[PDB]
Amino acid sequence: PGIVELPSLEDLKVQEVKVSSSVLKAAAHHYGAQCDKPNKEFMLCRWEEKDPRRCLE
């Protein structure tokens, strides 16, 4: 068996959404309406690739 390829630590850095769950809960309904397009593109990628390494972008 081979070696499990993994992206570099700097290939995973990004600005995280550092707010609490009640903030997301309060914004969820408008958030779902406003950010649908990138959100659904990402979820399409995850269920098609079945590989988190393939949807990092």
Binding site: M43, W47, K50, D51
Partner: protein, 63 residues
């Protein structure tokens, strides 16, 4: 019975018995190969049916 009737009746008996003997020997050989290789209709032990598998999207993506 005349000697020609018995003589040619014997040939008919011999043909049937000889053919059956050949088929009996083939069956032993065919059975030996099917059991050792499992590539024939005999000794075909069941495997799980793949039409029982659910192919729809699952609750989580990695599967």
């Amino acid at each position: 019975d005349g000697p020609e009737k018995n003589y040619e009746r014997t040939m008919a008996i011999l043909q049937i018995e000889a053919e059956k003997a050949e088929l009996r020997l083939k069956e032993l050989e065919v059975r030996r190969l099917m059991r050792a290789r499992g590539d024939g209709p005999w000794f075909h032990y069941p495997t799980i049916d793949k039409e029982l598998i659910d192919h729809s999207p699952k609750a989580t993506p990695d599967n």
